[PDB]
Design an enzyme around this catalytic site. Structure first.
Site, PDB file in Angstrom:
ATOM      1  N   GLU C 199       0.828  -1.208   0.000  1.00 53.23           N
ATOM      2  CA  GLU C 199       0.000   0.000   0.000  1.00 53.23           C
ATOM      3  C   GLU C 199       0.865   1.263   0.000  1.00 53.23           C
ATOM      4  O   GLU C 199       0.806   2.095   0.908  1.00 53.23           O
ATOM      5  CB  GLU C 199      -0.981  -0.005   1.178  1.00 53.23           C
ATOM      6  CG  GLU C 199      -2.128  -0.992   1.027  1.00 53.23           C
ATOM      7  CD  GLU C 199      -3.338  -0.388   0.341  1.00 53.23           C
ATOM      8  OE1 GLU C 199      -3.214   0.715  -0.231  1.00 53.23           O
ATOM      9  OE2 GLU C 199      -4.416  -1.017   0.373  1.00 53.23           O
ATOM     10  N   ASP C 200       1.694   1.372  -1.040  1.00 55.73           N
ATOM     11  CA  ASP C 200       2.560   2.506  -1.359  1.00 55.73           C
ATOM     12  C   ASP C 200       3.705   2.702  -0.371  1.00 55.73           C
ATOM     13  O   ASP C 200       4.494   3.635  -0.549  1.00 55.73           O
ATOM     14  CB  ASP C 200       1.781   3.825  -1.474  1.00 55.73           C
ATOM     15  CG  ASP C 200       0.576   3.711  -2.384  1.00 55.73           C
ATOM     16  OD1 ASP C 200       0.710   3.119  -3.476  1.00 55.73           O
ATOM     17  OD2 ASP C 200      -0.505   4.212  -2.009  1.00 55.73           O
ATOM     18  N   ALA C 201       3.835   1.860   0.650  1.00 56.83           N
ATOM     19  CA  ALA C 201       4.941   1.996   1.586  1.00 56.83           C
ATOM     20  C   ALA C 201       6.255   1.591   0.923  1.00 56.83           C
ATOM     21  O   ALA C 201       6.285   0.863  -0.072  1.00 56.83           O
ATOM     22  CB  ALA C 201       4.696   1.151   2.835  1.00 56.83           C
ATOM     23  N   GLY C 340       5.011   7.579  -0.833  1.00 59.20           N
ATOM     24  CA  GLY C 340       4.747   6.707   0.294  1.00 59.20           C
ATOM     25  C   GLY C 340       5.731   6.970   1.413  1.00 59.20           C
ATOM     26  O   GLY C 340       6.809   7.538   1.205  1.00 59.20           O
ATOM     27  N   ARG C 372      -1.146   2.108 -11.586  1.00 52.34           N
ATOM     28  CA  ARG C 372      -1.105   3.536 -11.864  1.00 52.34           C
ATOM     29  C   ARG C 372      -0.615   3.855 -13.270  1.00 52.34           C
ATOM     30  O   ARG C 372      -0.620   5.029 -13.655  1.00 52.34           O
ATOM     31  CB  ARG C 372      -0.221   4.246 -10.834  1.00 52.34           C
ATOM     32  CG  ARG C 372      -0.793   4.233  -9.428  1.00 52.34           C
ATOM     33  CD  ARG C 372       0.297   4.384  -8.382  1.00 52.34           C
ATOM     34  NE  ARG C 372       0.130   3.440  -7.284  1.00 52.34           N
ATOM     35  CZ  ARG C 372      -0.692   3.620  -6.259  1.00 52.34           C
ATOM     36  NH1 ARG C 372      -1.441   4.705  -6.154  1.00 52.34           N
ATOM     37  NH2 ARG C 372      -0.764   2.686  -5.314  1.00 52.34           N
TER      38      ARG C 372
END
Ligand SMILES: [Mg+2]
Ligand SMILES: [Zn+2]
Ligand SMILES: [Zn+2]
Ligand SMILES: [Zn+2]
Lengths: 601, 49, 573, 73, 77, 65, 49, 56, 378, 98
Positions: C199-201, C340, C372
């Site tokens: 999750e974008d981390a 992130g 994306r």
């Protein structure tokens, strides 16, 4: 003046009475943490040493609270304030920490620091639904960020690109009990909005499950033992090896996955990977004919698109979004309904760690060659684009010559626009199919799109084949100069390329005109979102204020505060939507099948 | 009414009461544009242009 | 129209004048604009299929004998507003011009703004991703100004080792971004690592952080003025005496000199005194009005400035700098809209390494890239690896940048895989990874959204005077708002006691006296030790009712609005 | 013991009720003098409550932060 | 003529008797003013010939329970 | 504003050979061959040396005391 | 930076979207997020006033 | 007869409040636990004395 | 096991009627396939009863707040913008009880004599569709020599309209008596009787062109689609009462987008059903899964008083008995002053007022009453 | 002088704080734009007149009746175009027509 002090968003009612700032609250950036359970939250040590919970001194906790007082505010675990039975508050410091500690007795209140196992409220704004605030268990961490488990993100709609979340510590025993009983994370796995799983696995969990449970996936003894230790599964001895390769035993991923399921669980369905229904038809016929098929017979005609679990053993199929994903996980939904929320929480905590270990050490990656296509595919895409352009030009010529037949209820211009848009959409679909033909299951991006982990097939299509037609408000691009969107095109040109048809793809590179058209489309999308959010919030507030007082009485009726009966039975059947099976009262077929299997097995 | 006409009706023509023929002619041009747009003689004006 | 255009091209009239021709069967109008506020663009004039700009003009520009204004003077290049461009037909490229074309585009990549030109290969990315990258380009940290140390800005940032991007557009050199960079080149490997980058981390190397990667310093400037009041009263710059009111404590003035000013290079903490000030009393001894550090902030005093204001009063400015080593929750963003926070800091021993001995500085999850539709990031990684291997920076200008296939061919010729994938070994197990991991060099920017400035924790403290409710803001030790939506979810959960504890017990709990006869608020007299209702009397039937102070304020407002609320009391049991 | 609010009855305040519930009559428009002390008969009269920490209410006798305030007319 | 009750959207409407109305009121422990209201000008009311003060029993087609019973009190316009 | 002492990736010291690299690059030599001659093999160290921009001299001109 | 006098809360669908006359004058990609999307603009690099 | 979630939460809160200000535990509990934990253990043991009044 | 025994066991079991029939049908279907025994059927029935008991909603649940949240949350991901305009504007119009919805659509069904062939459907549609003179005319030209407006029409639209020239001239002559109408070829010629002023020509020229020659008022566009071997007529505009009494139209399945027309023509219960159907259809089109119980609760609250009411300050909230709840939502000064005028009494039986005061809300644990015997010893 | 050579300038320093004026994208002054309101069923032309920093919105509109109307500031209701034409000096109808 007085009128302005009461009305409005910043008035006395909305700004100070219906909502107000509260004490014993914290807020910081959130970070992922798969190692903690879904019932736990990572609390910073600095936050824990500042926020305090008032605990009364009793007979069974006198020593612990005395130690907390003796430690002081600067030594974890300690306390910051002490309240005598007389009701006064004394601040704890180095000078008087011993004097207070030797003066502690029954009835005193000790404001100790936050410890492990404490119950706190975890909230993300905006709070669209009742799942936006849930009660977690405190886990103390040295760093300065909140930690939230990944399956709990979809209830909060929270990602980790700078999100901040609020933490609330209840101070009274009744509030703590209410948070622990009603608002625990595991108690709200099933969403009451649609009666399906909400706290479920996400992209990496789905991809790891697919990698583990796919056909031909085998693991060594060391890998199996390491993943069992990582997932926390209570396994003391390994099962019988499925096959031997070069003198070394190997275990199938289905065998390892079957250790998670309960021993009396049987379910079969079709997942998102089913592209050959003829292979699932034989499995369905074999299941229907006998209702207790032999495990050897099932494995002979096993298919990845049809998942079959018999007595807790994954005989066929692969894990995807239909296994334990949000709004689609049948296995997780069955586990919640037939085994409780604690068993479901344990299953989720184990399976997330198992899939994370599988995906971490096997190696999952995407590169620039994942969108690569052969020259024949590019030639076919170019041929399709040229054919679409020729068809659009022929339609334009027919409209100019007057031979175009008007559609019912529309004039010539709208008819021509609709025909052009339909032709361009068909061309985009054909290009997407051509791209999908040459992208196999070995591609990691295709795996992510097909398993439902993240992205769609259309996302891969745009980078591989072409972008398509750019439109705003459901119409082709027309805002610009007189008769043309851009000066670089001739006035009066109604062709596809002059109206926002991007023939290029992301990999090939957009032309400046195509870049401008894509920018127009993206701006339209962003504006649409930023406009829709306010209207949605206003409608939600109106609905909340309209239906705030409605509740279910002890006789099953729903009544207003005056006493007028709104519903003689809630939902006309007295069934909670959270506990409803796919919007129905009772899933009769599932109950019959499960009972028959249990009695005949 | 005289003050309103002088200081509010098209101030960019001027505030001198002599400058009323110019205001009348500008209003006539506006009416001509309105009639041309209404009868289909001329197209609409793009505010975002 | 043609005569006016020819005169403008010949230099007879000014270039500000723009002429447009409108032709129609019904109306025929000619528009000439020479006013202010018109936004124009330059275009090369094309005559009968041949542009007016020749190689001789380019040679003169390069040699310095010709300037841009000279080119405008001869009419080779003219500025066209939106009105004149309606009659134009501009060719995008010099090789695409025909006889029908009237103008030639100078630089198609120049249609973007300055922040939008920072993104390399913007035509390979989605439009929202490009918008996000342009937006986050202004939030990065770096050597913005060479005179940052002498400035007195309220907030400031400084990257310790800023780097010029390896893949950058040629406009960035002309703009000046290469002289004042705001980021670093990161060795980025696309890989899932223990679920801490989901999750974008992102996952960052511990040894890279310890070696100075993405190290930043945060600056804050405090000011203090010796204000002069009426009657000759004025503030004093001195260490306050313990006998004065408002004394903070002995240890808070430990860094102060005898003139009331903090010594430079002094370690400070929250609520530490920087300038010792005293003020005359109101309507007694002098009060304390010292300027102190924010409670949640710390650092080292960088400089102290002694000067005077415009009225002659003394002015002291103190700058405090804090070292910001990257940690968990620190926001990091690439130029392509991929953003992130740091999910986990992993030691170098546990990090994977390639067969060539390359350890990634950052690890990003593969799940965020294809959703994306960001191919520009992969192209930038390939170009950065190629530039590092060859020593020549890769041009990433829009529509004229280095082709992707050329970069892949160069990477293949350099001895690496064309796709940019390398054989990697697991850091923990030591075994070869089953898949070839994509690894490259990506320019990553550290944003000002740091967890050090965002962490806020409140238990008890100051409250508002009017509402007796917790204040707002981390600077004033405020609380967190429990809004209407939070009350809605609490109601939906059915937690009445939790709602009572949150909204009432912990925010504005108070007790008032209510008269049981007329429902008015009774008056308690501390002088006589008696409670009575003034409007009606009833010295006996008075009961104490607890409620929120906001409700009491609402009752007072209603009474002020000539509305009488009559509270009818009821027994609890 | 303790009591809770059962119901709230609304209405319009009568002039007699306003006069009776008033603690003082306000006639001086000025609030504070040059010295900063409240002006007797002004809007910041101590009979209506106290805001400054060193001030004492003439109707309650309490300090700032605990005096509820008193209505005028 | 087209009956108003032949429409798929219109459920069955039946006028309750006095004893049935009293039993309904006793079962839910409510007064006659705590029931849902239906206007006297409603097409169902004028089709049934009801008058204000009666209680109409509505047999709804429940998507969840199959058949559901709703009660409405006739009131003047 | 000054060249890092060690490479951010593997910790290899590069500040000693940075000024020679800058001097040889400004003389018209190929930066790749200069990096190869200085022992800079891995492209992470090449990333550190190539992408560095010297800015300390522009900061020294402003006095803080 | 270039701003618009229109209210941020109102949806100006015809004004917020990118116009064809913004080529070379207004940057097509650099816009803020939220109520300022499409109403706060930036000058293009080739733009001249 | 089964307890609802709201009734169980109310009973646990009342028992924890009673334990906080007296009301010695009716069963053996481990040392160092909170009064809420003691109330939860009492509910698990089925020893709670608090009943629920329902409308009739 | 015979079917009679299974039916007897199902009847003896405690279950709702709809569950009983489905369970009996499933047991009959499974009995021939696997030869179920009596004990297996009894265990299945017991499990079904247990599952039904488990699915029952507990008392005290905040069903209204949950319904409001479960409807508002999917609206945050809805999409904005033939000509049906669904989405967030559609649900906003539905919950606001708009008198005239944007782009009304009428779904018209046909009887057995017209639902099989396209010609009967076409003539029924042309009977329903309202055609006036301005759409039939190709161009408008004011003539001064005859001092009256002249109308010409194209043959294609006149032929498709279903009425010939004589029908047209008889329609205008009967409706308009101020001036006479003459026709030759394919042109309309109007002649005045006592009209001399030029200004009076414009007021009679516009009245002629907007007169409806045939069809129902408010309907301008009509399309025909085929689905399930049946022809369904979709029209633009809503006239439910007029279209109900039209030959060739089945009135049992005919419905309109306007809920107010449904309430006025069919009834309040039909209006509630139409509201539920519209919300369900909008949610299904948007791809959002919302449980129908929330929708039925919203519709029941919307039609509690026998009329359609919005959810704003003029609807459900406006007729709330609580003064504080009414004043807290949208209008504070007006509601408080109106309550002061009437001397209203707030019994504090709601949730918002108790939240404002600081008293427990009558929901969830707030409705639970506890008792305990005092002589309690360990 | 303690200034960065790369600083572009173009801003103001007010009380030690840097202030930058943001350009406003306004309509063209003294320019008439014609638009059609489909909801109100009218044709309205608006101009913004500038004189010494004063802006007045002069609107000429025509409704469904075919009668032109003029909107003037400090006037609460729209008035007829012929009335303004007469009050602006044109007495006879020939001047108004021409
Ligand atoms: Mg986010
Ligand atoms: Zn009294
Ligand atoms: Zn007082
Ligand atoms: Zn290195």
């Amino acid at each position: 003046t007085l009128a302005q002090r009461l009305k409005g968003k910043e008035g006395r009612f909305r700004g100070n009475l219906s909502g107000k700032r509260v004490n014993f609250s914290a807020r910081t950036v959130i970070s992922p943490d798969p190692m903690i359970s879904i019932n736990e939250v990572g609390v910073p040590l600095a936050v824990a040493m500042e926020l305090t919970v008032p605990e009364k001194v009793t007979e069974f906790n006198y020593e612990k609270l005395k130690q907390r007082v003796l430690n002081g505010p600067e030594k974890y675990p300690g306390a910051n304030y002490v309240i005598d039975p007389e009701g006064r508050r004394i601040r704890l410091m180095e000078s008087n920490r011993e004097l207070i500690a030797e003066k502690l007795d029954i009835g005193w209140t000790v404001e100790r620091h936050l410890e492990d196992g404490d119950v706190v409220l975890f909230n993300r704004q905006p709070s669209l639904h009742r799942m936006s605030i849930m009660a977690h268990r405190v886990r103390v961490m040295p760093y300065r960020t909140f930690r939230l488990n990944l399956p709990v993100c979809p209830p909060y709609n929270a990602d980790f690109d700078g999100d901040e979340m609020n933490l609330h510590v209840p101070q009274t025993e009744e509030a703590q009990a209410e948070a622990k009983i009603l608002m625990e994370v595991q108690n709200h796995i099933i969403s009451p909005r649609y009666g399906g799983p909400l706290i479920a696995g996400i992209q990496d969990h789905i991809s790891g499950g697919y990698l583990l449970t796919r056909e031909g996936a085998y693991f060594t003894r060391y890998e199996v033992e390491q993943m069992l230790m990582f997932a926390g599964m209570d396994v003391n001895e390994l099962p019988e090896p499925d096959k031997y390769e070069n003198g070394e035993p190997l275990w199938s991923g289905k065998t390892i996955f079957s250790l998670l399921l309960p021993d009396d669980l049987t379910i079969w369905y079709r997942n998102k990977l089913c592209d050959e229904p003829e292979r699932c038809e034989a499995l369905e016929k074999l299941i229907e004919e006998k209702l207790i098929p032999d495990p050897e017979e099932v494995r002979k005609l096993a298919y990845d698109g049809f998942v079959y679990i018999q007595n807790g053993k994954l005989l066929s199929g692969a894990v995807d979004k239909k296994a334990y994903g949000r709004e689609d996980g049948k296995l997780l939904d069955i586990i919640v309904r037939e085994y409780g929320v604690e068993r479901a929480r344990q299953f989720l905590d184990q399976v997330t760690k198992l899939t994370i270990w599988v995906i971490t050490h096997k190696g999952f990656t995407t590169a620039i060659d994942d969108e690569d296509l052969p020259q024949e595919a590019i030639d076919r895409i170019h041929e399709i684009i040229r054919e679409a352009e020729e068809k659009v030009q022929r339609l334009i010529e027919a409209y100019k010559r007057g031979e175009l037949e008007p559609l019912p209820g529309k004039t010539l211009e709208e008819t021509l626009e609709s025909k052009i848009m339909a032709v361009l959409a068909e061309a985009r679909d054909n290009a997407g199919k051509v791209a999908e033909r040459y992208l196999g299951m070995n591609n990691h991006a295709v795996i992510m799109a097909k398993t439902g982990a993240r992205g769609k097939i259309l996302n891969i299509t745009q980078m591989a084949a072409m972008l398509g037609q750019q439109s705003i408000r459901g119409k082709r691009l027309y805002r610009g100069y007189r008769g043309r969107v851009l000066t670089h095109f001739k006035p009066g040109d109604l062709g596809a390329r002059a109206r926002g048809f991007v023939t290029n793809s992301y990999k090939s590179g957009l032309t400046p005109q195509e870049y401008f058209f894509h920018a127009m489309g993206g701006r339209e999308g962003l504006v649409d979102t930023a406009v829709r959010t306010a209207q949605s919030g206003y409608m939600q507030r109106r609905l909340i204020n309209a239906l705030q007082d409605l509740k279910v009485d002890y006789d099953g009726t729903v009544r207003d505060p005056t006493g007028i009966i709104v519903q003689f039975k809630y939902g006309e059947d007295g069934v909670d939507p959270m506990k409803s099976w796919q919007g129905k009262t009772v899933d009769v077929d599932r109950v019959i099948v499960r009972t028959l299997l249990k009695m005949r097995g | 009414a005289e003050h309103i006409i002088d200081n509010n009706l098209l101030p960019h023509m001027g505030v001198d009461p002599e400058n009323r023929r110019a205001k009348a002619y500008y209003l006539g041009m506006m009416a001509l544009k309105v009639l041309e747009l209404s009868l289909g003689l001329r197209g609409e004006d793009d505010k975002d242009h | 129209v043609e005569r006016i255009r020819a005169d403008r091209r010949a230099g007879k009239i000014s270039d500000v004048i723009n002429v447009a021709l409108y032709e129609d069967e019904e109306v025929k109008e000619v528009y000439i604009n020479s006013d202010d506020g018109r936004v124009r663009r330059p275009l090369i004039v094309v005559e009968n299929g041949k542009p007016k700009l020749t190689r001789e003009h380019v040679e003169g520009i390069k040699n310095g004998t010709l300037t841009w204004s000279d080119l405008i003077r001869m009419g080779v290049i003219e500025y066209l507003d939106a009105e004149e461009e309606e009659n134009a037909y501009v060719a995008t490229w010099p090789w695409e011009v025909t006889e029908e074309h009237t103008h030639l585009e100078l630089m198609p990549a120049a249609i973007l703004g300055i922040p939008a030109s920072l993104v390399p290969y913007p035509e390979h990315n989605a439009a929202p991703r490009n918008t996000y990258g342009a937006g986050m380009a202004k939030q990065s940290l770096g050597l913005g100004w060479a005179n940052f140390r002498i400035r007195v800005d309220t907030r400031g940032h400084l990257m310790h080792y800023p780097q010029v991007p390896l893949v950058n557009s040629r406009i960035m050199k002309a703009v000046g971004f290469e002289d004042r960079p705001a980021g670093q080149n990161f060795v980025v490997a696309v890989l899932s690592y223990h679920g801490y980058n989901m999750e974008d981390a992102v996952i960052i190397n511990k040894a890279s952080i310890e070696r100075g990667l993405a190290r930043s310093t945060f600056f804050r400037t405090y000011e203090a003025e010796e204000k002069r009041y009426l009657g000759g009263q004025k503030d004093n710059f001195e260490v306050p005496s313990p006998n004065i009111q408002g004394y903070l404590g002995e240890k808070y003035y430990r860094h102060l000199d005898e003139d009331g000013l903090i010594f430079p290079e002094s370690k400070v903490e929250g609520k530490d005194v920087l300038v010792g000030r005293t003020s005359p009393p109101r309507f007694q001894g002098r009060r304390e009005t010292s300027v102190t550090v924010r409670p949640s902030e710390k650092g080292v005093v960088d400089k102290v400035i002694v000067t005077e204001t415009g009225d002659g009063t003394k002015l002291v400015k103190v700058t405090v700098r804090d070292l910001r080593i990257p940690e968990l929750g620190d926001k990091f963003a690439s130029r392509h809209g991929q953003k992130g926070v740091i999910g986990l800091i992993v030691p170098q021993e546990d990090m994977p390494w390639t067969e060539s001995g390359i350890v990634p500085d950052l690890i990003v999850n593969p799940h965020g890239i294809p959703s994306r539709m960001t191919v520009g990031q992969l192209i930038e990684a390939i170009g950065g690896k190629v530039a590092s291997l060859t020593g020549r920076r890769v041009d990433g200008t829009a529509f004229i940048g280095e082709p992707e296939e050329k970069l892949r061919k160069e990477l293949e010729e350099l001895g690496f895989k064309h796709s940019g994938r390398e054989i990697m070994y697991d850091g923990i197990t030591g075994r070869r990874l089953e898949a070839d991991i994509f690894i490259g060099v990506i320019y990553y920017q550290r944003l000002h959204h740091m967890v050090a400035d965002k962490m806020h924790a409140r238990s008890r403290g100051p409250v508002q005077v009017l509402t007796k409710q917790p204040t707002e803001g981390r600077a004033r030790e405020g609380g967190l708002r429990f809004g209407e939506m939070e009350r809605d979810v609490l109601i939906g959960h059915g937690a009445a006691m939790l709602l009572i504890e949150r909204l009432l017990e912990e925010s504005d709990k108070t007790e008032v006296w209510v008269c049981e006869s007329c429902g008015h608020l009774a008056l308690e007299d501390k002088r006589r030790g008696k409670v009575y209702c003034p409007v009606c009397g009833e010295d006996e039937r008075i009961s104490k009712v607890e409620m929120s102070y906001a409700f009491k304020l609402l009752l007072d407002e209603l009474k002020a609005m000539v509305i009488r609320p009559s509270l009818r009391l009821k027994d609890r049991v | 013991m303790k009591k809770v609010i059962g119901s709230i009855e609304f209405g319009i305040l009568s002039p007699q009720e306003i006069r009776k519930m008033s603690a003082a009559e306000i006639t001086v428009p000025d609030t504070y003098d040059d010295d900063g002390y409240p002006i007797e008969g002004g809007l910041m009269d101590k009979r209506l409550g106290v805001i400054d920490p060193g001030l004492r209410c003439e109707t309650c006798g309490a300090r700032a932060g605990e005096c509820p305030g008193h209505f005028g007319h | 003529e087209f009956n108003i009750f032949d429409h798929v959207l219109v459920p069955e409407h039946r006028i309750l008797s006095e004893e049935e109305k009293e039993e309904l009121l006793k079962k839910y422990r409510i007064r006659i003013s705590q029931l849902p209201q239906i206007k006297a000008s409603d097409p169902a009311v004028v089709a049934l010939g009801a008058k204000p003060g009666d209680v109409i029993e509505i047999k709804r087609k429940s998507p969840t329970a199959g058949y559901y019973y709703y009660y409405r009190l006739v009131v003047e316009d | 504003m000054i060249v890092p002492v060690r490479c951010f990736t593997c910790g290899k010291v590069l500040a000693d050979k940075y000024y020679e690299f800058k001097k040889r690059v400004e003389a018209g030599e190929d930066p790749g061959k200069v990096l190869d001659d200085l022992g800079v093999e891995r492209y992470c160290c090449r990333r550190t040396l190539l992408s560095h921009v010297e800015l300390i001299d522009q900061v020294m001109v402003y006095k803080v005391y | 930076r270039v701003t618009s006098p229109l209210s941020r809360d109102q949806p100006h669908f015809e004004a917020r979207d990118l116009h064809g006359t913004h080529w070379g004058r207004i940057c097509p990609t650099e816009t803020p997020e939220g109520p300022n999307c499409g109403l706060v603009k930036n000058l293009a690099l080739m733009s001249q006033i | 007869f089964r307890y609802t979630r709201f009734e169980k939460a109310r009973i646990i809160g009342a028992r924890a409040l009673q334990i906080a200000m007296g009301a010695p535990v009716l069963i053996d509990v481990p040392e160092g636990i909170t009064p809420l934990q003691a109330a939860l253990l009492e509910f698990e043991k089925g020893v709670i004395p608090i009943t629920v009044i329902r409308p009739s | 096991v015979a079917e009679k025994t299974i039916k007897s066991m199902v009847s003896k079991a405690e279950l709702p009627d709809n569950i009983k029939e489905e369970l009996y049908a499933k047991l009959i279907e499974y009995n021939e396939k696997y030869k179920l025994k009596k004990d297996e059927i009894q265990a299945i029935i017991d499990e079904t009863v247990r599952e039904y008991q488990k699915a029952l909603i507990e008392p005290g649940e905040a069903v209204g707040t949950v319904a409001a949240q479960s409807i508002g949350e999917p609206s945050t991901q809805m999409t904005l913008n033939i000509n049906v305009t669904l989405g967030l504007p559609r649900i906003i119009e539905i919950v606001d009880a708009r008198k005239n919805p944007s782009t009304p659509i009428m779904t018209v069904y046909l009887d057995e004599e017209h639902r099989y062939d396209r010609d009967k459907a076409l003539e029924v549609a042309r009977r329903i569709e309202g055609t006036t003179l301005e759409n039939l005319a190709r161009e408008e030209t004011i003539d001064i020599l005859n001092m009256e407006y002249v109308v010409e029409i194209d043959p294609e639209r006149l032929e498709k309209a279903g009425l010939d020239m004589e029908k047209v001239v008889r329609k205008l002559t009967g409706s308009f008596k101020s001036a006479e109408f003459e026709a030759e070829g394919y042109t309309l010629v109007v002649r005045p009787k006592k009209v001399t002023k030029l200004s009076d020509l414009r007021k009679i020229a516009e009245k002629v062109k907007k007169h409806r020659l045939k069809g129902l008022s408010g309907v301008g566009k009509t399309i025909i689609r085929k689905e399930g071997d049946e022809y369904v007529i979709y029209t633009e505009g809503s006239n439910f009462k007029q279209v109900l009494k039209v030959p060739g139209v089945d009135p049992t399945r005919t419905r309109t987008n306007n809920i107010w027309e449904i309430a006025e023509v069919l009834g309040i219960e039909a209006a509630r059903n139409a509201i539920i159907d519209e919300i369900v259809s909008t949610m299904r089109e948007q791809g959002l899964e919302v449980d129908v119980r929330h929708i039925m609760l919203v519709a029941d609250m919307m039609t509690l008083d026998g009329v359609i009411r919005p959810i704003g300050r003029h609807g459900i909230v406006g007729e709330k008995a609580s003064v504080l709840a009414r004043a807290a939502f949208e209008i504070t000064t007006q509601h408080l002053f109106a309550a002061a005028e009437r001397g209203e009494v707030d019994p504090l039986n709601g949730v918002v007022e108790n939240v404002l005061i600081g008293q427990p809300v009558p929901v969830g644990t707030g409705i639970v009453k506890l008792a305990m015997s005092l002589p309690l010893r360990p | 002088l303690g200034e960065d050579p790369k600083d572009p300038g173009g801003y103001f320093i007010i009380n030690g704080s840097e202030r930058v004026i943001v350009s406003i994208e306004d309509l063209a002054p003294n320019k008439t734009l014609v638009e059609r309101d489909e909801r109100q069923n009218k044709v309205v032309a608006k101009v913004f007149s500038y004189r010494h920093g004063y802006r007045a919105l002069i609107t000429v509109e025509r409704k469904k009746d075919g009668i032109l109307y003029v909107t003037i500031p400090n006037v609460p209701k729209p008035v007829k175009f012929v009335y303004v034409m007469r009050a602006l000096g044109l007495l006879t109808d020939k001047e108004i027509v021409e």
